[PDB]
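Supplementary Note 2. Why include the ligand at all?

Several targets in our set were suspected to adopt different conformations when bound, so apo predictions alone were not considered sufficient. For every target with a known small-molecule partner we therefore ran a joint prediction. The input for 3N1 is given below.
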Amino acid sequence: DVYAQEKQDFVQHFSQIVRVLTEDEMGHPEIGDAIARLKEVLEYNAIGGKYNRGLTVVVAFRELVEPRKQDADSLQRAWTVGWCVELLQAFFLVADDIMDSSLTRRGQICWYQKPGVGLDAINDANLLEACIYRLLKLYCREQPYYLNLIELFLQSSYQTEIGQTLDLLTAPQGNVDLVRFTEKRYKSIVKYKTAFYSFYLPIAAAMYMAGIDGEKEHANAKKILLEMGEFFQIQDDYLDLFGDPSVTGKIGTDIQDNKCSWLVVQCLQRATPEQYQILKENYGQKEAEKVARVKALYEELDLPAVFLQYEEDSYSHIMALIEQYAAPLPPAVFLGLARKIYK
Amino acid sequence: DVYAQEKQDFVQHFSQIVRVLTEDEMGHPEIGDAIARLKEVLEYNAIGGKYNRGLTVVVAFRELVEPRKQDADSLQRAWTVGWCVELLQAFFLVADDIMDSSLTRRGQICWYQKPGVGLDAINDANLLEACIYRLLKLYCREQPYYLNLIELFLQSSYQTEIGQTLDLLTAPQGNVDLVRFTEKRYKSIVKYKTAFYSFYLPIAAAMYMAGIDGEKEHANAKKILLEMGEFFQIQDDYLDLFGDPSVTGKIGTDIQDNKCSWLVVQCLQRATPEQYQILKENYGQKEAEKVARVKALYEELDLPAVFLQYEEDSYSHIMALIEQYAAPLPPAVFLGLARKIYK
Ligand SMILES: Cc1c(CC(=O)O)sc2ccc(Cl)cc12
Ligand SMILES: Cc1c(CC(=O)O)sc2ccc(Cl)cc12
Ligand SMILES: Cc1c(CC(=O)O)sc2ccc(Cl)cc12
Ligand SMILES: Cc1c(CC(=O)O)sc2ccc(Cl)cc12
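The joint prediction is reproduced in token form.
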């Protein structure tokens, strides 16, 4: 896979990123201890994921830029910007795990739950975010797309934070009000909180590094990418319950967490006064017996069939979007993402 | 005062800032509820302080720019950038109050302690930070100092976060180890965590808006400003204990909070094996009787006299620094700050 082969040079470049970010201590030994803390925060939270977002920057870069213009320095910058996307990701996860009181992440203990960390992780999360801009300055300061990348990253943070606000207001920890779990709210949350930084950002970054800064080109890529993000989250919600932990590599808990899942949203549109009550009395409960009661209602409403029907329509629509908005970009850029996301 | 008269037009401009930041909802009603939350976060956390940092941007701007170049739009931008400094301040305070479990701030209940907020304040704090860059883009996008201000603000956040890291590592909530309360550590913490964004940032911003972007000019202003910041914190620590709540407008708790105060740092350099024990057995305790025991030790070591002697030397040094590094800037810029800080 384009990601499998490149993943090696990606994860290997992290060592250099850490070195560069923790080398401003050579001239300021006074902050030495802080810099050492920063290194630990970086190694624990930026490593261990799949790097889908970061690698996307590298893969797209190689398809938008001519093979000869891909010199050592240009690729070095691509890997760096890819790692910037991963730090943004690390920033969000550390903060998010705190806000929803999670216990584990990527299998390991959430950073803030580690002995001696606690709420100090709030400052660690902000440092991760800050590192993004330090890397951009250190590697792209002289590039014509410098300001474009800074604003793209700042914009992605704002969008994601607005989305998190929406998500917090929608599922308040202490209010099992399924009334606000509408389809419009769900789509808005996905769009701002996940789609923008997970799919648009990586592609948009590569585009700017390739010299493609056209407002229309970015607008068309966004049209396609935000739709892929929407399908990504919907499939992710579906797999959380009906997926196989052996394959997916994770155990679903959206039901016990009272999450505003696509499943519950659909279940709310396809439910009778009596079916709704069962849902309103078994959603957000730790009892395995109550959770299974929700899964039963879902199948009873043939949601798995609804998802399948949605996956088919979504695939058709995406291919249509690619056929209409891909140009002047290589369709393979978007097709490669689709193939990764769709099954 | 230059601040008293200008403060009116400053606090009045906040209404416009809120309007502009909460008007992107006119075209995206989907995030309406999030935008309403943002407005509430802004009005509660950016208002109520003294606005010393923000006003400094406005006052300095009027002294670095010619009276005729101060048109309606230029002043509008100065007020906006001044409000950006205040949002950065609001971002830090909201986060800091959470990390150290504070109960009140500026007399009122800390935002996160408000019913229905809690840890969600972590995302609110990040939104405040994000607003800075939205304002800069909305008001200075076309200005030649645009990128300079973005980087200055990004750099101020990084510096302050590194300083907070240092401060967290120095006084861990659960380790009354006075061994790490050294003078070098104290000065490093003050410099990164407070001096850079509180004194350098405001002046540096006005400088760039005035067209003064010289690396040497900024380096000289920093030399002076960081020294003023150092004196500011030291005087603030001294007043926390020996100050009069009626005048200062706040009750000291550094002793009960086990803070790495300038006082304790001095007390640690001027203490005998027996005096140290008393300190090590009465610092960080809520008991009013133990706190008074610390204050007694301080006076016993004539710290108030030490502070007075330090204020005199600091004043002389600052005036020397101003006489040597002020140019080509108007000395009144720095003199005005000194007069505000020194008594
Ligand atoms: C993504 C996709 C297809 C494209 C492919 O061959 O990979 S055929 C098909 C049928 C059902 C569903 Cl649910 C998805 C797909
Ligand atoms: C599966 C996936 C994401 C979800 C994640 O890995 O956390 S972000 C992203 C971006 C591009 C591609 Cl191709 C896949 C993905
Ligand atoms: C700041 C300052 C002076 C300058 C002034 O007149 O305001 S004279 C003086 C004496 C003692 C101390 Cl502690 C400070 C000062
Ligand atoms: C007293 C003071 C600060 C402390 C605070 O108001 O929180 S930041 C600052 C910047 C410039 C001037 Cl002139 C004074 C101050």
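The interface with chain A takes residues 30-31, 33-35, 37-38, 95, 98-99, 101, 116, 118-120, 122-127, 130, 133-134, 137, 146-147, 150-151, 154, 157-158, 161-166, 168-169, 172-173, 184, 188, 192 of chain B (CB under 8 Å). The two ends of chain B are 15 Å apart (CA to CA). Comparable summaries for the other entries are listed in the accompanying table.
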